[PDB]
């Protein structure tokens, strides 16, 4: 059992966190979650959960990793081991997350190999996959609305090849399956420690995606009709806030895009030095993450407003109200750039870079927690080459279910339920509750002061005590007292077995906490008042 390594430099933490949760949850998912919830109304619970629960739980898992130099699961051995099932819940969340996140990267890669033509296949619709109800978007205001855009038909009929529902999975798309396998080879050969441990990361991870996001923002803001998209993006419809879809979507988009019910930020904090001020670095990285989401949302919603101006249809109905929105709006914007082939290549390499670095961080966090769970069973040698390949192989094979002919329906089920549903509220509420009330805000603030150097302020104290538990419990209860079923793109109603499977994914994430509580109360000898007292005592 070798001693646990640290980062060996201060900037290795920041690059592994900037590459950690600045990814597709900012540039791909905050877009359609904002779009699906009316745009303006999404930002109010977004910033409420950001400034009451996002940066709080972000600093919370980072400093839990820094305090207890352990990743994900075994970090709770000194943070009330009775709730050690928060770590197992986090690993279930991050496993299902790795599956569907890498499916997004497979779609981006399929677009990338379809970007090298002189004419982009979504730029026009005289192809084999296009319905006869299509023409160019520039011609949609001159013909007499049951007419469909070339980018939308490309997305649903050559990339997705979208089927009638989750009841009809269709055939496995061999193109997308090979794309998914190539991206998993890229991931496996980067968790193989040969790549990403270089000095050229900073000019290829923190430099080029933000430059490409700046170029996309410049292109989207100068489009005609971008002001209507910005008004859709910013101006809140208050009546939507009385519905729990917007609160759940915004709160779990905070908890998703901060990667913060996953054990991965706990894992990244576990390589921090003890006496190392993680707090200011966490604030800078959280500002980077939320600013990336906000700026890329400005970009993509300006593009959506341009599309609504050009096609003559309303903003909320111009593209997909579901997981494909970054694959309609951003390719459509790229077709409006000079030399759109080169910008298609750069944009899908940008998505690949963001999503790949994020995937390396979450996959490495899952692996870090699972080798902290079993040291000397998974050493730094040959067993962490076979376990790595096994984790990648089952995540790829279970990702084949979501990349078939009807794989968007399974993907939207995974996205809404498996790693960003009430499971994120569950794990975040229980993290804040265990800290604040079984471990103590005062005792944990003393722990923080021993290494950070100062007392965390009343914001962190009252967020871990009151604000994050109240927000998570309120959205959890309010999503059930006013329950609406998951729908894909406002028109597909899911069958009850599919909603049950999504709830099963959520509960497989959720129920790791009470089942570990039951197992630990059953494996410890004594009465209940002695068992609970022993299992809440840190080790």
């Amino acid at each position: 059992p070798p001693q646990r390594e640290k980062w060996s430099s201060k900037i290795d933490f920041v690059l592994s966190v900037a590459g950690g949760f600045v990814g597709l949850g900012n540039v791909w998912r905050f877009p359609y979650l904002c779009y699906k919830n009316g745009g303006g109304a999404f930002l109010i619970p977004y910033f409420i959960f950001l400034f009451g629960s996002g940066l709080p739980v972000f600093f919370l898992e980072v400093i839990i990793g820094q305090y207890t130099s352990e990743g994900g699961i075994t970090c709770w051995e000194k943070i009330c081991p009775l709730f050690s099932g928060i770590g197992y819940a986090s690993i279930v969340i991050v496993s299902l997350l790795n599956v569907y996140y890498i499916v997004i990267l497979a779609w981006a890669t399929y677009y990338l190999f379809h970007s090298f033509q002189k004419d982009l296949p979504w730029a026009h619709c005289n192809h084999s996959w296009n319905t006869p109800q299509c023409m160019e978007d520039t011609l949609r205001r001159n013909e007499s609305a049951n007419f469909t855009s070339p980018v939308i038909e490309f997305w649903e009929r050559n990339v997705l090849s979208l089927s009638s529902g989750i009841d009809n999975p269709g055939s496995l798309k061999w193109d997308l399956a090979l794309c998914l396998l190539l991206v998993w080879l890229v991931c496996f050969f980067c968790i193989w420690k040969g790549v990403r441990s270089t000095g050229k990361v900073v000019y290829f991870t923190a430099t080029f995606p933000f430059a490409m996001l700046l170029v996309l923002l410049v292109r989207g803001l100068t489009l005609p009709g971008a002001g209507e998209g910005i008004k859709f993006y910013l101006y809140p419809d208050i009546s939507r806030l009385g519905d729990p879809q917007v609160w759940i979507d915004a709160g779990t988009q905070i908890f998703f895009s901060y990667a913060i019910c996953l054990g991965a930020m706990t894992s990244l904090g576990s390589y921090n030095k003890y006496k190392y001020n993680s707090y200011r670095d966490c604030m800078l990285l959280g500002c980077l993450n939320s600013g990336t989401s906000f700026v890329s949302g400005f970009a993509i919603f300006s593009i959506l407003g341009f599309m609504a101006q050009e096609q003559g249809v309303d903003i909320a109905d111009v593209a997909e109200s579901g997981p494909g929105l970054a694959f309609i709006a951003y390719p459509k914007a790229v077709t409006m750039m000079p030399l759109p082939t080169f910008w298609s290549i750069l944009f899908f390499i940008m998505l690949l870079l963001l999503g790949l670095d994020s995937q390396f961080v979450e996959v490495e966090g899952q692996i870090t927690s699972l080798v902290d769970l079993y040291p000397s069973f998974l050493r730094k040698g040959y067993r962490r080459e076979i376990f790595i390949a096994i984790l990648c192989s089952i995540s790829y094979l279970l990702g084949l279910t979501m990349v078939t002919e009807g794989g968007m329906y399974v993907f939207q089920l995974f996205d809404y339920y498996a790693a960003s549903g009430v499971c994120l509220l569950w794990v975040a509420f229980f993290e804040c509750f265990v800290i604040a009330w079984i471990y103590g805000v005062n005792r944990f603030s003393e722990d923080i002061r021993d290494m950070i150097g100062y007392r965390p302020g009343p914001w962190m104290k009252y967020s871990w005590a009151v604000i994050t538990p109240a927000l998570c419990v309120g959205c959890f209860v309010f999503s059930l007292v006013k329950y609406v079923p998951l729908t894909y793109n406002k028109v597909y109603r899911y069958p009850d077995w599919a909603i049950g499977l999504g709830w099963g994914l959520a509960l497989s994430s959720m129920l790791c906490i009470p089942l570990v509580i039951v197992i630990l109360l059953c494996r410890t000898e004594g009465p209940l008042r002695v068992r609970i007292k022993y299992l809440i005592t840190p080790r």
Partner: antibody
Amino acid sequence: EVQLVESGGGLVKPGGSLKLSCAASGFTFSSYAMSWVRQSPEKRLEWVAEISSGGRYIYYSDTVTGRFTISRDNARNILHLEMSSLRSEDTAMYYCARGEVRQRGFDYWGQGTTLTVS
Amino acid sequence: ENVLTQSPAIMSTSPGEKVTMTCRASSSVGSSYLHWYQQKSGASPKLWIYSTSNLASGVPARFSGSGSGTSYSLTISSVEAEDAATYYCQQFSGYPLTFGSGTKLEMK
């Protein structure tokens, strides 16, 4: 008004024992780490012992790392420093210092207890 | 220990003249962790400059601090008659906390 009043300093024999009592007032004593800093008659400030807010993290200098014990009484708001095996080079001017934020230092000091060893 | 070798204790300057005093540390202090304390004649020390630049409450703006890593400085723009005191630098990062030597400012 943050007030730190120390007491219990006097003349002790070499190898003896003494207990100081920094009585804290005007602030929530359980929320700040407190230190004992001693000043030699040559006026060279030396940090002795730091205790955290709850007493879980306790630090000592190398000169007193095995014979000094710092403790708090958070209910009545008194900081303590119990000494043993008081050697000749412990004659000093003992201050309790409210050092909790490490990027701010000992922002409030107390008065002094003249510990003399002879 | 992190020994802070500070400027020699006996320095004597006329009032109203800009003075400076240095504080060299054996190890590398993170420059948000070395603080300056002013102790008068027969009084307790009090915090003067913290995180080597910020001025504590009741410290005049004519005091200033500078430096990082190893060399740290206390600077007075114009010494008034109330500056006759001893100034101690003190890293407050490494858990064996150490003060500097004395630097006594005296008049003419």
